[PDB]
Amino acid sequence: KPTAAHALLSRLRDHGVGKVFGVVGREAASILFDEVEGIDFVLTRHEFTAGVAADVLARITGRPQACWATLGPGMTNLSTGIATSVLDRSPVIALAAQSESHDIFPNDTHQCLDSVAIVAPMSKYAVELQRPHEITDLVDSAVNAAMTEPVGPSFISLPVDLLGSSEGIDTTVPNPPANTPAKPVGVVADGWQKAADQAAALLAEAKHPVLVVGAAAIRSGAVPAIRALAERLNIPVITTYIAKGVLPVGHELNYGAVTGYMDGILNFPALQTMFAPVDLVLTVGYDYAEDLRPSMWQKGIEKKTVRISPTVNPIPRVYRPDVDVVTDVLAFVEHFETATASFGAKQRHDIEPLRARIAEFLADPETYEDGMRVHQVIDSMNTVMEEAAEPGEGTIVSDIGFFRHYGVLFARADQPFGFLTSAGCSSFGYGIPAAIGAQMARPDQPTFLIAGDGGFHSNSSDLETIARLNLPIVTVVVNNDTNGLIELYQNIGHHRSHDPAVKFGGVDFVALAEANGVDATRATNREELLAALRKGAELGRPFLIEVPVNYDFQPGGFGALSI
């Protein structure tokens, strides 16, 4: 007779779920994962990989995804993936086993932790199953909470005895309709249209407005609408890290992405050039978690600001917009098109010196004694991605480190979510599972990953998962035998380094990949790197490329990082 295990997998399938990522423990006595046709288990080497792969799959598909862990330490390993999902905003259903219900004594029973209490502060919803047949409504409530803005994960704790139980379960009676939201449910304030009208009046009087676009605008389905608004009225578009690609590469209104590290990296007044003459900032789908902070746009002349978001402002201490429009992003744009219908196009401010500096970094022909420079690595990746991918296709994924902020400035994105990194959480080791998630969401597109030696090695065991699933991801490891970003912070704070806190011995990443069954090679210059990338791109199997790199810090150049 069918149990709560069958009822759970069956209800996930009603919500569109086809994959469950995770690591299975002793609950395997209660759940096989073959109970239900059309839903497959994806075994990873660590739970973090499972949670992040589901997060990225959820982001690109716009549908709820699922991950799985065992009791105790499985659940705690999964929590970093849950944390990724709450801060990066993706609808993940996280599931973990628990001790037999009559034996639940947290911190006393073997492997028994108070899972709901640990996960509740970092989730949209968190419950423990108590009566086997209720798992259907628990899944529904979890999906409901996950798909409400700010989107995030929901958690269900599953005692092994109840999971294997058929008490109260009747599969002859069909399940009620799932009614999965097509896009996230939002918060809407009374009179938002009047606030939108007030923003239109500010726009009329503005000489140099900009649109600053966040990931929430992509979730809402507002990209085509935003593009048409900016095009008609001649308004520049600036983005957060993952909102890169809302305009295609080469578009005249594509003014780039912001990272607080950009002035220090380029050795240039980059933020001043972007924002100094701007008099109106419209932050369309604003989220403070994406790390584009008001302090960053506050350059030069005084500005008016308009916040548009499907949530009430959580941070009035930091951001007090002149006009606050609490509504669905697409709904705002469609109303705003009506309010600005008869407006004349603007004159946009000049940022050519900034564009030249960036182009100069990408074209950098110099060779160096201590390896390549990261901007040269990314230029090579851009070239081969453009070759390998159809127009508007392809994904570059970035792990976390100093190199990541080079990705923000320099990486090609020819579609929304075409450059993927961790927006709010920024856990190192993100890259592999995000590349797994990206390649599964876009099976016929090229997927390149860039990672640093510190972050890559924190989670490199799931190379074996990439080989086992035969996912044709091409990985570049930029290696400096250091947690580089942290050495920068040491110098910023103390004006010197302390090696015991940041420095590694050597790891042969080529030999490491090959030990996992992934073909690999070392590249030490542009020519060797282009050849490696093109070989990887056409291989039909995963490929890894190790590149020696180095940084030259200017610690005085990073005042924009202050909080």
Ligand X SMILES: Cc1ncc(C[n+]2csc(CCOP(=O)(O)OP(=O)(O)O)c2C)c(N)n1
Binding-site residue positions for substrate: 261, 291, 404-405, 561
Q: Which of 241, 332, 406, 428 is catalytic?
A: 428
Residue 17: name its binding partner from ligand X, K ion, a second copy, none (Cβ under 5 to 8 Å by kind): none
Q: Which stretch binds a second copy (CB under 8 A): 243-251, 341-349, 511-519, 527-535?
A: 511-519
φ, ψ at 277 (rounded to 5°): -90, 5
Footprint of Mg ion on this chain (CB under 5 A)? 452-454, 480, 482, 484
Minimum distance from CB of 493 to ligand X (Å)? 15
267 given a catalytic annotation:
no
Residues near ligand GVA (CB under 6 A): 26, 110, 260, 291, 293, 400, 426, 485, 561, 563
**Contact flag: residue 428 with ligand X (CB under 6 A):** yes
Q: Does 452 bind ligand X (CB under 6 A)?
A: yes
> Of 204, 228, 511, 539, which lies in the binding site for a second copy, with binding defined by CB under 8 A?
511
Question: Smallest distance from the beta carbon of 152 to ligand X, in angstroms?
Answer: 19
* Rg, C-alpha atoms of the chain: 24
Q: Does 102 interact with a second copy (rule: CB under 8 A)?
A: yes
Bridge partners of 97, per DSSP, are 158
Distance, CA of 416 to CA of 435 (rounded, Å): 16
Q: Phi then psi for 231, rounded to 5 degrees? A: -65, -45
Residue 143 near residue 64, CB atoms below 8 Å: yes
Pick from K ion, Mg ion, a second copy, none: which does 130 bind, CB < 5 to 8 A by kind? Answer: a second copy
The annotation places the binding site for thiamine diphosphate at 400-403, 426-428, 454-455, 480-485, 551
User: Exactly one of 5, 7, 20, 23 binds ligand X (CB under 6 A); which one?
Assistant: 23
> Binds 401, which of a second copy, K ion, ligand X, none (CB < 5 to 8 A, cut-off by type)?
ligand X
Residue 101 near a second copy by CB under 8 A: yes
Q: Which is nearer to ligand GVA, 173 or 563 (CB)?
A: 563
Residue environment code for 186-211, b if the CB has 16+ CB neighbours within 10 A, otherwise e: beeeeebbebbbbbbebbeebebbbb
Residue 452: contacted member of Mg ion, a second copy, ligand GVA, none (CB under 5 to 8 Å, by partner type):
Mg ion
- Checking 246-253 for CB contacts under 8 A at 24+ apart, the result is 246/213, 246/217, 246/218, 246/416, 248/392, 248/414, 248/415, 249/412, 249/413, 249/414, 253/348
Cβ atoms of 10 and 139 within 8 Å: the answer is no
Q: Which of 14, 27, 47, 379 is catalytic?
A: 47
Which one, of 79, 94, 103, lies nearest residue 146 by Cα? 94
Query: For residues 32-51, which are near K ion according to CB under 5 A?
Result: 46
Q: Measured between alpha carbons, how far is 328 from 453 in angstroms, rounded to an integer?
A: 40
Query: Which residues are annotated binding-site positions for Mg(2+)?
Result: 453, 480, 482
Question: Of these, 33, 197, 386, 550, which contacts a second copy (CB under 8 A)?
Answer: 33
Tell which positions 480-519 bind ligand X, by CB under 6 A.
480, 482-486
Nearer Cβ to ligand GVA (70/447)? 70
Active-site residue, from 275, 336, 419, 551: 551
Amino acid 157 reads S
- Residue closer to ligand X, measured from CB, 112 or 187: 112
User: Considering the rule CB under 8 A, would residue 457 count as an interface residue with a second copy?
Assistant: yes
Report the b/e string of 372-390 with b at 16+ CB within 10 A: bbbbbbbbbbbbbbeebbe
Q: Are 89 and 64 in contact (CB under 8 A)?
A: no
Considering the candidates 480, 487, 546, 558, report the single residue annotated as catalytic: 480
By the rule CB under 8 A, 201 interacts with a second copy: no
Catalytic residue among 3, 259, 382, 482: 482
Residue 105 appears among annotated catalytic residues:
no
Angle at the Cα of 242 from the Cα atoms of 16 and 356, rounded to 5 degrees: 150
Contact between 77 and ligand X per CB under 6 A? yes
The yes-or-no answer on residue 553 being catalytic is no
Binding status of residue 498 toward a second copy by CB under 8 A: yes
Please, which residue, 365 or 506, has the CB nearer to a second copy? 506
Q: How far is the CB of 147 from ligand GVA (least distance, A)?
A: 27
DSSP classification of residue 520: E
Q: Which residue is nearest to ligand X (CB)?
A: 401
**In terms of DSSP bridges, do strands 474-479 and 543-548 run parallel, antiparallel, or are they unpaired?**
parallel
Closer residue to ligand GVA, CB minimum distance, 293 or 522 = 293
Beta carbons within 8 Å of 468's beta carbon, 6+ residues apart: 517
Helix (H) or strand (E) holding 40: strand 40-43
In this structure, are residues 379 and 406 in contact, taking their beta carbons and an 8 Å threshold?
no
> Is 480 one of the annotated active-site residues of the chain?
yes
Question: What is the spatial distance between Cα 372 and Cα 141, in angstroms, rounded to a whole number?
Answer: 51
Between CA 381 and CA 54 the distance in angstroms is 26
Q: At what angle do helices 352-362 and 402-410 cross, to 10 degrees?
A: 120
Q: Is 134 exposed, middle or buried (0-12, 13-18, 19+ CB in 10 A)?
A: middle
According to the binding rule CB under 8 A, does residue 288 interact with a second copy?
Answer: yes
Known catalytic residues?
A: 47, 428, 453, 480, 482, 551
**Which residues in this chain contact K ion in the complex, by CB under 5 A?**
46
Interface with ligand X by CB under 6 A: which residues?
Answer: 23, 25, 70, 73-74, 77, 400-403, 426-428, 452-455, 480, 482-486
